[PDB]
Nucleic acid binder design. Structure first.
Lengths: 287, 287, 287, 287, 279, 287
RNA sequence: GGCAGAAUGCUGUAAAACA
């Protein structure tokens, strides 16, 4: 199915251990790039979440952020290190003896690293819930991508309908275009004949006759819109395939615009460029 | 109707507690880029804000910054962890017995992590007003775009009037230059004392007239100014269509300059090219 | 007069509130692009500053940066969160009751986050001074543009005198076209020893004399240097008009080089192309 | 054998001293960059660890973390630095003389870095096992890379088979396209009432056919897929070479698309570009 | 002499204040375009630096970056903001009212941000030394252009020697060409007219083409020693070379002269390709 | 005399006070950054050490470790910045005048950054010997860098011999390729075409010869290996100069691949890019 | 108009680069 490369997904899980929030953002990119902002406590989950991301997403820069705020009140009571505190007090008394003046601060002893440390919580139980929330976030992310992808497909199918209409309007002027093609070649034949001892006369006519195929340019445009409809229903990653198709649309419209056949044909040729330009806008953020 | 691609809208809301400001900027771009700088608390508004913006704007580098200024005075009172504070004080008194000296600092106990924190935020109600301000800011942003859009349209229309005047001037000058060549050619024959063959002079003068015939270029230029006037009345965005029309304008001006032989016609062609360049400069800012 | 596109202006203002610095720098550009890097407190000045910049300037890549350095101490007494400071005192007092001993350091409460809110500034009287500094910086920027522009005008006029000198040299080293081809044909036909008709041969000499005659090309070169002098004295924007004029200068030099039949003319054509190239380089710096 | 730049490997050793864990993770990178998260006890092993990894590996970003968990008995209690403590007391007394007031806080002396530091064991025997454990991790790392690289090689081979199929399809379609295009071009001249020498016209038709013939491009594509198979069969460092081969693939496909006439050839060129893009995506993750 | 538009030059000036590294990098360009990445402290030097560079270079896209690494110890001695300290003391006194206890610590006031900030550096004598390094870097930059332009000059002179050899080879066949031109003139006359004959005589003969080629070679040799900006002048000379050789390429008499003309065209194309990257 | 950014130098100094070991290690970096592991006894030597190291080095991440083993016979003292220590006390006294209370903690003055600093003028007997040991260690570190960079120079020059081999290899294929194109073209015209019509065969071959003419790229490649040899003997910091040279190497190598019409040349141009990639990897280690 | 392709604009590349 058609998918977009700009989606936002968010999930949050709460419990006695605390609250953990998963956030996922996507921006357009040629390849798949994953950047993580995991907390230091759960730094060990990076390979697993990276594999989970790469297993479902196929293109676009992805930013994943995990915020973990433990419940301090629900945490176990802090335990006082009896031996470590006693060691510091005896050591601090020695410094008082050398300096002959001192005042032990009881809070400063408690603030020392190690002493008065809370018991470590069971991170293994939290990891499973966090991974479940990550899977839910991936599901929401894919749903958001698909929801916006349908909008892009509708916009592109709207533009492609206009391209066929513009081809029909240009085909309405074929009797005038065919008359113009003859005059382009007839004038060149006699213009070169007026010039004397001019070589490569046949080369000019042969090259010129190849570059006035207005009928063939419309056929290729009509063949691309038929194919572009088929590309949109491939159910695979067609983001890049459409990007290479837009270059073929650009190639045909560029040659048609430079013809300058007629005032009314020029308006349609300008419109073809506009439709392709608008169509190329949507292809940028398709996956 | 038409809109400028650069604008600036700022809206500030003074709620019961705190205040928020919505700021929008826009710069010229070939596609639509929407960059958001939302605060940490309201980071989840991006999908809602992005949808509400991409549905009203077509092109430009739109940057939206939401600045949240909480009222600490009106903020919820910090909750004091009585049990955690009591645990530290009793443990501090344990050190005091062994140290035999020292006084517990009341501020130091409060400075301990987890003793005091903001228990409640209640951001669901305050986020509704912020989103409501966004709809107001977009309306001002669109009006700012349309206000500057009219100046661009007026400038483009003035330059189009100048283009029509220059075309009329060239058309007026053309017959005199056509007659000037005939007098100069016969003068050289008279100066060379050579009697040209019958119908050779008439045949030769046809080639020069074809060389200096710019009627088709002027007709195409008038058709292009009429088409540009029609385009400027369209409700859809016309930045790309006008930018493509300027290419046809440039083609006609280049052909006129190339086929020019008189100083006055060359000066008029240069004036046409200057007018087209000014038109394109104004077009770059059109939606 | 004419103004260079690249310039640099800087202006610093001091006061009891602090220091502010305006820096404006521009470089060559096809159109007018203005990028503003304003401080956070003064982001609301962007529309006014942009309007003034666009009013004063025609084209360039102008970038304006405002550096704001508020004084740390201002507005008399420091702004204190009275509720938060009082709230911590009550909480600290409760800790004293349990421990029966303690003291509250005033700086400890001041160092508490939120108690010392960001110092309030008027931000309205300072805006007038900043806008006045912006106007002064615009005056300096325009003066610097005009000073550099006068040097560019001298360089262009020096090369224009070179073009007139080269045209004089060509008109003196150019032999009589009718006589030059007559002598060349006679010698070549002397080997053939057969002449179809002397009467018809003389007619073709005059008709095809203009093919190799460069008198017409030289007159247009002399007409353009007179026009280029006139363009340099206009009050409007001149860079675009002169840039399109150099195309006409190059058009004549190419035709003069191709039509050249003598080494002196060809060497002069190269010299003309060098002078035009040197003259075209300076025009790229004129707005 | 071909290897990948993304792999994982973990090794742990259990002993009476404690438990040490080695973790290696690789992410694709242009060059080799090594980051080490080593404990303070084994910080001196970084130059030894870095040399072993840089010698065995060639490319990719590698992050190696050594998780050292000593036993309670193996932990060394903090030892007071009496020599350093007495120096600070003398240093503090010098400042007291300048101020004539103040008292030295005994805890503040202890909190000074280096005064209260745990004794460091020899750990020479323990580190000897760590290096052997690290060498085991590196041995499994290469094996881990090789298994992952086999899938990439299989994918690249499948896409190369698709490329060969597309090339043979284009070669099958081409002669009919060439035959019809020549027939259409000569018929176009007849409709324009242009009479040309058959010998001269036929010579121009042959040269134009050589201009629009794509046999050489397909031959180059076949040679490129054969060389790609050889490169895959090569031994080491076939990432960047293979990427350059993909650049050549893209060049040939772009030439084929630009020189194409029929819609089928254009569709085949689009398919070739899609296959080359997928190969580039896979190859970006190859050492 | 000949200057190549691509070069690199680096100079580092070191001192008690820190370091300052100038890194000029240049590639090809039709005109002179300079881009600067200056540190925030020395961004005001752009007009002075830009003027200095524009006066010593003629073409190329120059990218000059100044890297400033100020020293921590180079900062001035601390000064006391008496206005800010007094405000903090009054602010501290307010808290003492509610608490009705406590003593303000003088050092804690000094530890507050902004009350003992160091004096700003002069940044005036430093800029004088930085501009001295820029002047030196340009001298190194020019040498890097000249040491690369000598190779291009040698290649162009080699191609010019090849062109002279080809011209001599063509001149060795002058009587054969002269006979061919007479037959061509008679053939058109005997076909029957005057319209075609007059322009045929107007066309440049082969000997004049070779003389113009030799004159172009001599002028190119002089230009390579002109000792100024000769990139565009050499490009125009190559255009003239192409215009002269097109006649020989078009004319067909025999295999040897055709091969010599093809060699001349290839040599002129190589010269033109190598000219594009000379300042 | 190329210096590499990876080196190691250890120097031990023995005296009556004990044994002091200076170790210096360097790792690749874009700029110069120094980290010190001085014991707190000699912590005040950090500014002088940093000044000397930044004076004698240009680029690279440098880690310096000093191990000090004092003896009971000799006792040292902490070097203090007397000028700054007295200034802080004077400033504190001024604050005491306004507050009319307070006391100065001696440890607070010492903890102030810059107070625990040393200068070369005021150094102990041991400190001067430590500084001399550091000078010797830095000289040995420079020697190690020079002798490690000699290996890098050999590695790079080995690749440069490959580049000249590829350049002379392509130069032999070029006369064969152009000659082979002649046979292929006349084979097509050998069917029923008399190629002796004007010079279409020769003009096409001339046009083809100018399209595939890679002589300009090969000469610039050869002129860049001559200059790269001289850069490797400049006896200065040429790490960045070589990096810019490789960009010029890749610029000509990639253009050679593009203009190539034969598979052998393209396979050679791929080899040129690989040699550049191998050289680029070593250049990252060059100071 | 960094180098180069096709014919203002679009691709390849330096760019897994430089801010």
């Amino acid at each position: 199915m058609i998918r977009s490369m700009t989606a936002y997904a968010r999930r949050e899980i709460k419990g006695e251990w605390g609250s953990a929030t998963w956030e996922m953002r996507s921006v357009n990119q040629r390849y798949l790039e994953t950047y993580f902002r995991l907390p230091e406590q759960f730094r060990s989950l990076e390979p697993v979440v990276r594999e989970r991301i790469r297993s479902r997403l196929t293109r676009g820069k992805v930013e994943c952020t995990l915020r973990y705020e433990p419940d301090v009140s629900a945490q176990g009571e802090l335990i006082l290190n009896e031996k470590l505190a006693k060691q510091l007090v005896t050591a601090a008394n020695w410094v008082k003896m050398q300096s002959d003046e001192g005042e032990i601060n009881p809070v400063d002893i408690l603030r020392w690293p190690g002493v008065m440390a809370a018991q470590e919580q069971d991170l293994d139980a939290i990891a499973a819930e966090i991974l479940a929330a990550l899977d839910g976030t991936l599901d929401d992310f894919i749903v958001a991508r698909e929801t916006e992808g349908q909008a892009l497909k509708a916009l592109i199918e709207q533009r492609l309908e206009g391209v066929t209409a513009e081809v029909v309007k240009v085909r309405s002027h074929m009797p005038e275009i065919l008359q113009w093609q003859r005059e382009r070649l007839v004038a060149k034949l006699e213009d070169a004949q007026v010039q004397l001892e001019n070589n490569r006369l046949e080369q000019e006519l042969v090259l010129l006759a190849q570059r006035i195929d207005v009928a063939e340019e419309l056929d290729r445009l009509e063949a691309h819109v038929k194919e572009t409809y088929n590309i949109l229903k491939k159910k695979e990653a067609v983001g890049r395939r459409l990007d290479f198709m837009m270059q073929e649309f650009n190639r045909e419209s560029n040659t048609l615009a430079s013809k300058s056949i007629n005032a009314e044909v020029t308006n349609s040729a300008i419109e073809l460029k506009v439709l392709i330009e608008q169509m190329r806008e949507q292809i940028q953020n398709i996956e």
